[PDB]
C-alpha cells in the first residue's frame, strides 16, 4: 500500500511517502520545543490516480480527470492519512514539560 | 477562508480551490453514469503554508519545513476538506436509478 513501509521497499511512479526527517529547529526552527532535536515526520509526494488509496469520492473523480488528459495540473493531492504522536519536551517559562504531540508523524498516505 | 466562495472572489498565492467543471464522460468518460452530463467537481491547487487552514498537526510542521527552505518540493498538499453530494442517474442493466453520490463535489479545501 502507500505506507512508509511499502514506499521504502521498492520503486513506484504514483504517490509514495518518502523520507523527511525534520530537525525541529534546523528545518522548522521551532522555539517552543526543546527535545527531541527532531523526528521522522515522513511525508509523501507524487500524484495519485484512482485505485491508489482513494479517501473521498472526489479523489477518484479528479484522479481520472487527470489520468485522462496528459498535462492537467489539477490532479489530486496525496497526503498523510494516518499519523502518529511525538514525545517531546518543551518549557513554559521555567517549568519543564514532556508531552506527546498528536498526529505529528506520518504512518501512511492516501489521496485527499 | 480557502472555500470555493473566497477563491473566486479575489487573488492569492497560497492554496485556493479553483474551477474544475468535470463532464462525467468528457473528462472522466464515466460510463456508469448517464446524467447529469457532468457537474462542478471544483478542486484546489497551490501549496499550503501553516495558518492556511491546517488539518493535521503534520500539516503545520511540514508547512513550515518548506516555508523555511526555498526550493523544497516536500510542502503539504491542499485538498478538499468538506465535500458535497451529486444528484445523478445511471442504469443497472435496463432499470433507471437516480441517486446522489456523496462527497463527489468540493465545498472548501484545507491542508492534509
Curated annotation (Swiss-Prot), chains A, B:
Domain of life: Eukaryota
Record note on what altering residue 109 to R does: In IBDIMDE; loss of TGFB1-mediated activation of SMAD signaling; mutant TGFB1 is not secreted
Cysteine-cysteine disulfides: 7-16, 15-78, 44-109, 48-111
Function: Multifunctional protein that regulates the growth and differentiation of various cell types and is involved in various processes, such as normal development, immune function, microglia function and responses to neurodegeneration. Activation into mature form follows different steps: following cleavage of the proprotein in the Golgi apparatus, Latency-associated peptide (LAP) and Transforming growth factor beta-1 (TGF-beta-1) chains remain non-covalently linked rendering TGF-beta-1 inactive during storage in extracellular matrix.
The protein's name in its UniProt record: Transforming growth factor beta-1
Subunit structure: Homodimer; disulfide-linked. Interacts with TGF-beta receptors (TGFBR1 and TGFBR2), leading to signal transduction.
Subcellular location: Secreted
Amino acid at each position: 500500500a502507500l505506507d512508509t513501509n511499502y514506499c521504502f521497499s521498492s520503486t513506484e511512479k504514483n504517490c509514495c511517502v518518502r523520507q523527511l526527517y525534520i530537525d525541529f529547529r534546523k528545518d522548522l526552527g521551532w522555539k517552543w520545543i526543546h527535545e527531541p532535536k527532531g523526528y521522522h515526520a515522513n511525508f509523501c509526494l507524487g500524484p495519485c490516480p484512482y485505485i491508489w488509496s482513494l479517501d473521498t469520492q472526489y479523489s477518484k473523480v479528479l484522479a481520472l480527470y487527470n489520468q485522462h488528459n496528459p498535462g492537467a495540473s489539477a490532479a489530486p493531492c496525496c497526503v498523510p492519512q494516518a499519523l502518529e504522536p511525538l514525545p517531546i519536551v518543551y518549557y513554559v517559562g521555567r517549568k519543564p514539560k514532556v508531552e506527546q504531540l498528536s498526529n505529528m508523524i506520518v504512518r501512511s498516505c492516501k489521496c485527499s
